[PDB]
Design a protein around this nucleic acid. Structure first.
Lengths: 386, 63, 136
RNA sequence: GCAGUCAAGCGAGCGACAUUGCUUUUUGAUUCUUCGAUGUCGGCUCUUCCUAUCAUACCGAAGCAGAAUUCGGUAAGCGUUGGAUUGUUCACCCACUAAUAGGGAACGUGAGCUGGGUUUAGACCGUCGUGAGACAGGUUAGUUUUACCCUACUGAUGAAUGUUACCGCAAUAGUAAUUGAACUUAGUACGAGAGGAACAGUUCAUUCGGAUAAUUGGUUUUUGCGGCUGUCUGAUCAGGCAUUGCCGCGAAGCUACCAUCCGCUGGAUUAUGGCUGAACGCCUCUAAGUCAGAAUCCAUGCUAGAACGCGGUGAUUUC
RNA sequence: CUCUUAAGGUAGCCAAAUGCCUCGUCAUCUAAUUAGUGACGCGCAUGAAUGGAUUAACGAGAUUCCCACUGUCCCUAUCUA
RNA sequence: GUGAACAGCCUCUAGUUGAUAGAAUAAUGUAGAUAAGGGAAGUCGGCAAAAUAGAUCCGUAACUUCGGGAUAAGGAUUGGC
């Protein structure tokens, strides 16, 4: 018979299977559409998540009750040192998909990028691109003939960039490597730009601007095998239930006589690949700038790092991108930022943001002070002072 | 923006921290953390708690 | 919400589900109000309707003057004990739940409110802000 | 239970006397399978399907205007509740809402729960019998067992492809957003007046979903700090035991519409409305052709990545 | 008035553990009550040691409401062995 | 020893240190807990858990077989020197 009282189902069928992701990097499925008119430029970037903080600003939203009023919002900072370009790959369009045609690497690759090709580095002979580097020789005929084919045949050109992990405080020494698509210019200009930038760095300020809207891709925080009640939000059974009450009661009918994929079942929760969208940038800071956390209305020389360092990360000493709210991922993880795939003309998209105060009270507890000089003024001399 | 003062302790409540309370007689009390908010709800006198501004002022500490 | 609403209300935490007794804050002769519904609620398979500060609820008078008892009559929530966040970052709460009687289009049955009144109820009801003494 | 045809009658629309059908959510008829046993009513919890459409969407019409109401068509994408009495199925009331539609899946669902009903043995009462005892009459108390096997579903590894390592393509499968209100248009169009809209634009909210933990709140074996009782170490100091002795606060972690953030835009078509135009010298959206078109469909986008689909690239062993 | 028996239910009591029709009708308790209580009684089929009506105290008996209290529930989360 | 107490808790004489162990800390369990706002809206049903609790002083209704109801109900105090 029919169910007595209706209700929506639990969970979303578009996010199946709920399994561990293949790689710790979430891969950028789609890149923005190209138009050949503009200059050459990257479409995505790589960074490392740091933590969160608080921001106070005015609201420029005509019509709303809080127009020209203060509002407190949350933000998340991403440690983004410059990326290093180390190769170019060309893709031809075939009736059964795209297809790479050639990869042309640079000559000298850093140690931290060629750690990505070894599992047991400490006992290796460090033989990696050793024969390839002898290709530049005295003339470089081999390399320049390979680039000739990319200009002749490829329809999509991409670039290989490895992040400079050594600068971030992570204990990891191996550097990530990922492909970023070049948009803008003829196919000829695209491959030339890559060649000039071999071994050169590309900073964050050359990709994103302050009020842009971007998309985040990253692998979510994992939790392991999880029951039905916290994997799909199913109702709990009454107290007087024999053989457990955090279980789904009916897992199907007599017929079809097979458990359906649509039923809620226990298993992996967390560690999926997600692509959130429409995050507004709030600041594009500079690493070698003191007063990274100051503003027009604050005016105190202090950096973005709270007191005691971001919990479980450390201190920020490079460029950074703080965005409105949450991005998928946990702290310390690789996060890849993408340019939006459509022109957003909403009021929210076009709104311009000028901050008024960035928080730096310790996140390791109920912080009370913003600067070590503020603590000394309020409290005065202590015994441990000279 | 404005920085407030905790009623029980006298600390500074930067935006988005603590809680606010409005009892029947319209009086407003601001607290910086749950530690102070609890010590208020236990009808406990600030001038006895050692780490507060009222206690230090009363005992003439920090001259 | 109601005919007398002056506009929109930003969400605040629900804290007075069906079955909650909340003081009467006016001089209409009632001592307390008893929520039996909330205007502007939705549906879910076991979700109880809950009212917040500014909502017009349908309510009965449990202890109060005889004429006002034994009949369903609207009300407006003027205080609540559940703590809610304003867009300016401040969590706050009153020390009691209260409300006042009203007709369908937001006119008070009485002529005086005793105690503080939330600014979100006053901004939404022109005929509650008139009789309010102190607004927080 | 549902639906047609006739057209006397009533008044765009209803419909008698007759009469042709459909469904298997009613109850009968029959006794084909099961009596060396297929666990029986209802409720709870959960997935999916049908359409005989309550709501939303798109069209048509009524009545000499609005507004509201009513009727008819395409339509299963999405939704369809909180409760008082009752074991209920059904039913009736109060209340909100866009609305509170009808059904199937061994009258779905008892090695998933519960045991209020029925349906053993104890007990009472009314009527019935001389009696033992009878009664789809009322009342009260009454043991709810087993998974480690195969498959199915949810997750997790994995030999073999020279070896090993990094970066990718994308067949196939899945998919998602939903509904209301207020400001402006505007006291305008319309109408004698009373009254009273709509497209473009803006601010919020209901229902669902995916994450995240700056802040707020929950939790405490941080047994971190303090406090208190009894007793034991001769006293103080510092400690033992009281199944974590009790009390206040309590960072980290986990977590809550109890907190916060995010939830895309293009094409093709259905009903319908047109262009040109015959059949049928006129006529006609149609027969050839062709323009616009929606909660519809397909792409964009989002999840997996065939462990027997594929490509690029690095290094390939001096006793 | 009349048929009829051995005699034709008296004092009491009731939709009660005894009433089919039945969710009887009226009032009270609720926003709403097939529930509870107080009333009415041609009572299918109440009633006198088949004991009738009432009754303070008592009851791991059956039923209804109120105050207090609470994770039963809204709506779940966390800790220990 | 504490206390009204061969209650519960700690100890002296005497007696045992016996019950397969090592390692991590998933889901579901058994046993023990705590929860903001509401307070029975859950359920056939307050089933389960919670709240009350010792002692001293004050105050204690209807009904009653005059013995009871009664710890009714409702309040206040409690350490150390």
């Amino acid at each position: 018979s029919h169910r007595k009282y209706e209700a929506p189902r639990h969970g979303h069928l578009g996010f199946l299977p709920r399994k561990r992701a293949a790689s710790i990097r979430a891969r950028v499925k789609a890149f923005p559409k190209d138009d050949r008119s503009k200059p050459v430029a990257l479409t995505s970037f790589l960074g490392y998540k740091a933590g969160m903080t608080t921001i106070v600003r005015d609201l420029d939203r005509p019509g709303s009750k809080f127009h020209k009023r203060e509002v407190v919002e949350a933000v998340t900072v991403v440690d983004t040192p410059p990326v290093v370009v180390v190769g170019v790959v060309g893709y031809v369009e075939t009736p059964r998909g795209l297809r790479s045609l050639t990869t042309v690497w640079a000559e000298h690759l850093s140690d931290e990028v060629k750690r990505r090709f070894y599992k047991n580095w400490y006992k290796s002979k460090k033989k990696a691109f050793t024969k390839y580097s002898a290709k530049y020789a005295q003339d470089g005929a081999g390399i320049e003939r390979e680039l000739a084919r990319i200009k002749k045949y490829a329809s999509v050109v991409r670039v290989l960039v490895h992040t400079q992990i050594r600068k971030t405080p992570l204990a990891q020494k191996k550097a990530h490597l990922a492909e970023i698509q070049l948009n803008g210019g003829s196919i000829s200009e695209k491959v030339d730009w890559a060649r000039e930038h071999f071994e050169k760095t590309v900073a964050v300020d050359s990709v994103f601007e302050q009020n842009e809207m971007i998309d985040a891709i990253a692998v979510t925080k994992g939790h392991g095998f999880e029951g039905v009640t916290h994997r799909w939000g199913t109702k709990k059974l009454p107290r007087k239930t024999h053989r457990g009450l955090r279980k789904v009661a009916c897992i199907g009918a007599w017929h079809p006589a097979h458990v359906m994929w649509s039923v809620a079942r226990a298993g992996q929760r967390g560690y999926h690949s997600r692509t959130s969208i429409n995050h507004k940038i709030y600041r594009v800071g500079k690493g070698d700038d003191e007063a990274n956390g100051a503003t027009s209305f604050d005016r105190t020389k202090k950096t973005i790092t709270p007191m005691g360092g971001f919990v479980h990360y450390g201190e920020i000493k490079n460029d950074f991108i703080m965005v409105k709210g949450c991005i998928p991922g946990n702290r310390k993880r690789i996060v890849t930022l993408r340019k939006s795939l459509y022109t957003n003309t909403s009021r929210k998209a076009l709104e311009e943001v000028s901050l008024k105060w960035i928080d730096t009270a310790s996140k390791f507890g109920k912080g009370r002070f913003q600067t070590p000089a503020e603590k000394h003024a309020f409290m005065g001399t202590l015994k441990k002072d000279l | 923006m404005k920085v407030e003062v905790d009623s029980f302790s006298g600390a500074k409540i930067y935006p988005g921290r603590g809680t606010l309370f409005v009892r029947g007689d319209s009086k407003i009390f601001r607290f910086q953390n749950s530690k102070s908010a609890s010590l208020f709800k236990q009808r406990k006198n600030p001038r006895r708690i050692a780490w507060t501004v009222l206690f230090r002022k009363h005992h003439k500490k920090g001259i | 919400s109601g005919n007398g609403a002056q506009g929109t209300k930003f969400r605040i935490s629900l804290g007075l589900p069906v079955g909650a007794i909340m003081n009467c804050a006016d001089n209409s002769g009632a001592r307390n109000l008893y929520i039996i519904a909330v205007k502007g609620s939705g549906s879910r398979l076991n979700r109880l309707p809950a009212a917040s500060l500014g909502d017009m609820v349908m309510a009965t008078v449990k202890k109060g003057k005889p004429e006002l008892r034994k009949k369903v009559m609207p009300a407006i929530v003027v205080r609540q004990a559940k703590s809610w966040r304003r867009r300016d970052g401040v969590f706050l709460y009153f020390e009691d739940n209260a409300g006042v009687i009203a007709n369908p289009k937001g006119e008070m049955k009485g002529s005086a409110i005793t105690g503080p009144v939330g600014k979100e109820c006053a901004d939404l009801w022109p005929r509650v802000a008139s009789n309010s003494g102190v607004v927080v």
